[PDB]
């Protein structure tokens, strides 16, 4: 009889929680290509000429 509706209100309260989510990310660097160049005095000059 002492515990009333206007002597003990009863509130509900929660916090806003973001939904958990599981994702994959694979980072692969730019491809690396072998190059073979030869330089001789003539091949320089041939272009130069």
């Amino acid at each position: 009889t002492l515990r009333n509706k206007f002597n003990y209100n009863t509130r509900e309260c929660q916090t806003i929680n973001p939904s958990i989510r599981e994702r994959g990310v694979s980072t692969e660097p730019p491809p690396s290509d072998t190059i073979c160049g030869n330089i001789t005095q003539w091949e320089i000059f041939d272009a130069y000429y």
Binding site: T40, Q41, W42, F45, D46, Y49
Partner: protein
């Protein structure tokens, strides 16, 4: 013409000459007139690389001056090559 195709026939018929072989600029056989095919196939692949390597030798010292004629001389044989931009002529002459 009789004149290239005759001179080439003449140097073959000439005594103490194993064979004359024309190499294409892309290391290919246009005419190959040796006895055994292994030698002709071997000469077709090996010698035009020596002439390109020997062209870079004369070129480094003076890049105006280009190869006109290369002659190697081995113990038993001689090897003579007349390189041009379109074709290269190769011969093997035994030393007298």
């Amino acid at each position: 013409m009789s004149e290239v195709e005759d001179t080439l026939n003449r140097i073959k018929t000439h005594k103490t000459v194993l064979g004359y072989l024309i190499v294409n600029s892309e290391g290919g056989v246009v005419r190959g007139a040796f006895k055994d095919e292994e030698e002709s196939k071997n000469i077709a692949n090996s010698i035009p690389l020596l002439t390109k390597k020997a062209r870079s030798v004369v070129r480094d010292l003076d890049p105006t001056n280009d190869l006109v004629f290369l002659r190697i001389q081995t113990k038993l044989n001689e090897i003579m090559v007349a390189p041009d931009d379109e074709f290269s002529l190769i011969v093997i002459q035994t030393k007298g």
